[PDB]
Amino acid sequence: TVRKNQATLTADEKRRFVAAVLELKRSGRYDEFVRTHNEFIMSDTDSGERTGHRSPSFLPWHRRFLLDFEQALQSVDSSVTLPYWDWSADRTVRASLWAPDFLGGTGRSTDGRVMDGPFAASTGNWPINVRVDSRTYLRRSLGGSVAELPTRAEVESVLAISAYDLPPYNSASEGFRNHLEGWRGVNLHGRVHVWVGGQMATGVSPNDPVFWLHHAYVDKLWAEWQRRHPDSAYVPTGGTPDVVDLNETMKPWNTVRPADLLDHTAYYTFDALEHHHH
Amino acid sequence: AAPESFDEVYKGRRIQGRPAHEHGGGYEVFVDGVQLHVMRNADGSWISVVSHYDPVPTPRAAARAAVDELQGAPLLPF
Ligand SMILES: [Cu+2]
Ligand SMILES: [Cu+2]
Ligand SMILES: [Cu+2]
Ligand SMILES: [Cu+2]
């Protein structure tokens, strides 16, 4: 499985990715991913049990969640893999990401409604069902709520952080995981959700297919971090209340641990990933 | 210490807050009588499920952010 930069997909790869995503939606399988995500968003808390978010397992949890989704796509079309969106490089509304042959663009100004691309409500193919805001059409406001996406220089300063995570292992932590997740620092992953707007700014953010491309790049940045810091590894490593330790299993699956997900190459590679070097 | 309660009409909608599939969170917010899931972060900021990635200082700020996000739409219960 090779995960490719979205900017580099061929027309045929874009077409097959879109068709596979729409088939998961038509068959009812897609919306269960949205629901699982929102349940963890609402249940993960800084002072209590936390698994998918605001915790060291944010990264292995999303890696396995994206694996579940990619395997569902491959059960529809075995050639499709998740692409990633390098929002540090493809940072404007003119990125081919946002073209009508891929994800469609920004929402119109009155109601945020996306009006083009395969996921526009007018196609009849992308009902928003699992939702909190009662409207049932895909919405976006690219750059509406926050002026700019992270830059490469900002990403680099987070990749330079040596410690994977630090007590208290939550949204107040210093360390790589929380700077990437974004709750401290210049904010990488959370800022991108804010920048897209619409459902992506909510706990039901997988309603927007860009969710998967964003998280595939967050996942790639973890891989890059490991290359930068081969000497540093997941923490904590046992006996931490409310937090998933290295060799503890993770909900919802219960059959997988952070330890089983540290090495992505057991499941996929990237089109390009620098190896370790000074 | 829980925040104080509040009740106001904000952009035409009734928003309320009070100390009290999701976390057991010690504060409840309502938009036009429908409860809105909200959460407090370790630094004392708040978020809501319709503006989850954008911390604001208080539960009323979260309720107001939800009314802004909704653009007039009814909330659905969680
Ligand atoms: Cu998530
Ligand atoms: Cu995300
Ligand atoms: Cu070295
Ligand atoms: Cu809750």
Side-chain angles (χ1 to χ4, degrees):
Chain A
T1 279
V2 176
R3 293 198 179 167
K4 302 173 212 209
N5 189 325
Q6 63 79 24
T8 69
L9 301 188
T10 64
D12 283 336
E13 292 172 322
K14 284 175 204 172
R15 167 176 59 73
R16 288 171 187 259
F17 172 80
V18 169
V21 168
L22 293 177
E23 180 49 22
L24 288 186
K25 172 61 78 162
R26 188 205 64 80
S27 67
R29 302 176 67 183
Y30 192 93
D31 287 336
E32 309 292 330
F33 287 95
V34 181
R35 200 185 312 278
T36 294
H37 192 262
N38 192 47
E39 133 188 30
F40 279 81
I41 281 278
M42 289 190 290
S43 307
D44 288 335
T45 54
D46 275 333
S47 52
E49 179 169 327
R50 48 199 180 277
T51 296
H53 301 88
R54 47 185 76 240
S55 61
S57 48
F58 166 70
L59 287 174
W61 191 95
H62 284 82
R63 175 169 282 185
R64 177 57 187 251
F65 189 55
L66 264 59
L67 275 165
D68 289 356
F69 180 74
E70 187 177 61
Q71 288 171 357
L73 287 175
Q74 288 170 339
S75 77
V76 176
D77 180 337
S78 62
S79 76
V80 170
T81 59
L82 293 183
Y84 60 89
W85 173 31
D86 179 349
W87 26 254
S88 82
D90 295 288
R91 53 192 296 98
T92 67
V93 302
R94 329 197 271 293
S96 50
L97 186 48
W98 302 120
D101 73 339
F102 202 167
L103 302 187
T106 196
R108 69 173 165 196
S109 46
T110 47
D111 59 3
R113 187 176 309 201
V114 176
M115 305 300 304
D116 71 349
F119 309 101
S122 57
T123 63
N125 286 334
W126 197 255
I128 306 299
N129 297 316
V130 176
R131 67 197 191 283
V132 188
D133 180 318
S134 68
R135 295 175 291 175
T136 57
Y137 51 88
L138 179 65
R139 294 174 289 107
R140 293 176 184 140
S141 181
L142 306 184
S145 291
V146 66
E148 293 286 334
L149 289 161
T151 61
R152 176 111 248 12
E154 286 170 354
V155 171
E156 286 299 331
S157 66
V158 170
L159 296 170
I161 300 171
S162 180
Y164 175 81
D165 207 343
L166 285 168
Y169 300 120
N170 63 16
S171 74
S173 290
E174 301 294 11
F176 172 65
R177 186 268 318 155
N178 200 37
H179 278 82
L180 175 50
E181 186 174 358
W183 298 109
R184 293 289 179 277
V186 82
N187 190 349
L188 296 186
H189 149 272
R191 178 154 46 127
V192 176
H193 280 274
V194 173
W195 185 91
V196 171
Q199 288 82 12
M200 251 311 258
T202 76
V204 293
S205 54
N207 275 309
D208 189 331
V210 77
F211 177 88
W212 309 103
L213 277 69
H214 173 37
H215 272 278
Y217 182 61
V218 172
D219 188 75
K220 188 182 192 231
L221 289 179
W222 184 21
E224 294 181 22
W225 175 87
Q226 300 169 332
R227 294 285 177 91
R228 279 263 262 273
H229 306 280
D231 57 314
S232 207
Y234 182 95
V235 285
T237 59
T240 310
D242 290 328
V243 176
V244 184
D245 293 278
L246 176 58
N247 290 329
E248 183 177 350
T249 58
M250 274 188 308
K251 293 175 188 190
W253 314 276
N254 302 315
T255 57
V256 72
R257 316 166 297 163
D260 306 304
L261 288 152
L262 303 182
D263 183 358
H264 65 280
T265 65
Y267 313 95
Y268 48 89
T269 55
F270 296 101
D271 53 356
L273 185 67
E274 265 243 40
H275 214 297
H276 180 67
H277 55 305
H278 311 270
Chain B
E4 310 291 335
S5 73
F6 68 87
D7 184 0
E8 65 178 44
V9 183
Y10 172 76
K11 307 188 163 189
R13 306 205 50 198
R14 183 104 165 261
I15 56 174
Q16 298 166 275
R18 63 199 192 178
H21 299 178
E22 30 91 12
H23 82 322
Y27 198 88
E28 296 172 333
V29 166
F30 300 81
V31 179
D32 294 330
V34 187
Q35 193 180 159
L36 177 71
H37 201 264
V38 295
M39 163 184 314
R40 186 192 172 287
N41 284 343
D43 68 356
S45 292
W46 295 74
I47 54 188
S48 88
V49 59
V50 302
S51 201
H52 181 85
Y53 305 89
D54 213 343
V56 294
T58 70
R60 182 174 17 236
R64 293 180 171 172
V67 165
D68 295 345
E69 195 281 341
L70 287 162
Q71 301 176 305
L75 201 59
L76 294 193
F78 59 90

